[PDB]
């Protein structure tokens, strides 16, 4: 997971007002990755390898 | 001769209730009401005078 944002909630308001507003809530994101592979191959000649 | 010409009837005393439908955390609204009535008794136990 990752917390992208927290958002804004609440504000200072005039006392005479009798209600309040809705803010803009934050955002959360789901992320994922991957794993990679390394490979190779090599070959020999038996007699040459044995006599070297 | 009142107490027989006219009667007065009461049912419940005044009551006050708070209203959650419009009572924010920063405001209040109150409701109240009461009931009563009356009905003429004997028609012969009183007279009225008028100009003519």
Query: How far, rounded to the nearest angstrom, does the alpha carbon of residue B29 sit from its chain's CA centroid?
Result: 23
Residues in chain B: 52
* CB-based contact B32:B16 (threshold 8 Å): yes
B26 to chain A: which residues are within 8 Å by CB?
A: 18-20
Contacts of B19 (CB under 8 A, 6+ apart): B29, B30, B31
**Residues of B whose CB is below 8 A from A18:** 24, 26-27
**Contact criterion met (CB below 8 Å) for A24 and A42:** no
* Angstroms from B18 CA to nearest CA on chain A: 16
Report d(CA B35, CA B9) in Å as an integer: 9
Structural method: cryo-EM
Resolution (A): 3.4
Torsion of CA B14, B19, B25, B28, to 10 degrees: -40
Q: What is the dihedral of CA A42, A45, A46, A50, to 10 degrees?
A: -90
Closest by CA position to B42, among listed B3, B16, B4: B4
- Consecutive H or E run containing A51: helix A46-51
Token pair listed for A1:
């997971």
| Residues B24, A19 contacting (CB under 8 angstroms) | yes
Tokens matching residue B41: 């008794």
B46 contact partners, CB below 8 Å, separation of at least 6: B1, B2, B5
In angstroms, the CA A41 to CA A36 distance is 17
DSSP A48: H
A2-11 exposure pattern, b = at least 16 Cβ within 10 A, e = fewer? eeeeeeeeee
């Amino acid at each position: 997971m990752k917390i992208a944002d927290y958002g804004q909630l609440g504000e200072y308001t005039c006392d005479a007002k009798c209600d309040a507003e809705f803010g803009e809530p934050g955002n959360i994101r789901h992320l994922e990755g991957k794993t990679y592979d390394y490979r190779g191959v090599f070959c020999f000649n038996r007699k040459n390898l044995q006599e070297a | 001769a009142w107490k027989t010409a006219y009667y007065a009837v009461e049912k419940r005393p005044m009551f006050f209730e708070q209203y959650e439908g419009g009572s924010s955390a920063w405001c209040v609204k109150y409701q109240f009401g009461a009931e009563d009535g009356g009905f003429v008794g004997c028609c012969e136990h009183g007279r009225v005078l008028r100009i003519g």
